[PDB]
Amino acid sequence: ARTTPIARYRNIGISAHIDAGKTTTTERILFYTGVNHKIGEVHDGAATMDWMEQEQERGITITSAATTAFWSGMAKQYEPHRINIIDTPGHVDFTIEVERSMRVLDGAVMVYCAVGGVQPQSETVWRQANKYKVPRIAFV
RNA sequence: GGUUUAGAACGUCGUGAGACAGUUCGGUCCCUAUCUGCCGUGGGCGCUGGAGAACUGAGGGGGGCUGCUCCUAGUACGAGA
Ligand SMILES: Nc1nc2c(ncn2[C@@H]2O[C@H](COP(=O)(O)OP(=O)(O)O)[C@@H](O)[C@H]2O)c(=O)[nH]1
Ligand SMILES: [Mg+2]
Ligand SMILES: [Mg+2]
Ligand SMILES: [Mg+2]
Ligand SMILES: [Mg+2]
Ligand SMILES: [Mg+2]
Ligand SMILES: [Mg+2]
Ligand SMILES: [Mg+2]
């Protein structure tokens, strides 16, 4: 019946300031789980999540897009977990979208830049996550 | 080709011949370079005995233009775009 046990389900979001690497980190996720044959770059519009023509041309995420993966482990340590990742936007022009995805998800991976670190949109996603008390981790 | 020759016509001016910063069609553009100048190329002599070659280098000339794509780099800057 149920393909994967309830414990092996992750509904996660990738939230942070504009251009912290969120859309790339999602491409490298879809790559290390084999679902996409090409790595693709955000600047060259190759990114699958950036499907809208505006997203391809301007290299920005103007919407939330959802994808799935099967991450066994680094050494196949665990049984394949079905991670539902909905890539989100960081532009203040689209905050409803990040809160929209943020509410349902059980965890958030907050991207950051090593040069800048805490940025305005990073505080914005922080306050939004804190009000909904989502458990968080961070990726620099 | 235009402008300004001789032909002809329009409009206008004049009685007229003709005329118009008015127009219209047609209408002969010569020279074998003496000298300077310049581009080449040699003959004479000189450089102190004659000759063959290899050069130094004062000086002179030639050349000096730039686009686009990628890497750095979505890097610095920018809340962003
Ligand atoms: N140097 C470098 N550039 C990165 C890295 N991750 C992403 N980028 C680039 O930085 C830009 C912004 O990243 P992106 O994933 O589009 O951010 P998002 O729009 O917030 O999801 C894009 O041109 C990416 O290719 C990284 O680790 N290093
Ligand atoms: Mg993005
Ligand atoms: Mg005659
Ligand atoms: Mg010269
Ligand atoms: Mg010279
Ligand atoms: Mg580029
Ligand atoms: Mg950019
Ligand atoms: Mg723009």
Swiss-Prot record:
Cell compartments where the protein resides: Cytoplasm
Binding site for GTP: 16-23, 87-91
Family to which the UniProt record says this protein belongs: Belongs to the TRAFAC class translation factor GTPase superfamily. Classic translation factor GTPase family. EF-G/EF-2 subfamily.
Task performed by this protein: Catalyzes the GTP-dependent ribosomal translocation step during translation elongation. During this step, the ribosome changes from the pre-translocational (PRE) to the post-translocational (POST) state as the newly formed A-site-bound peptidyl-tRNA and P-site-bound deacylated tRNA move to the P and E sites, respectively. Catalyzes the coordinated movement of the two tRNA molecules, the mRNA and conformational changes in the ribosome.
Designated name of the protein: Elongation factor G
Annotated source species: Escherichia coli (strain K12 / MC4100 / BW2952)
Taxonomic lineage of the native organism: Bacteria, Pseudomonadati, Pseudomonadota, Gammaproteobacteria, Enterobacterales
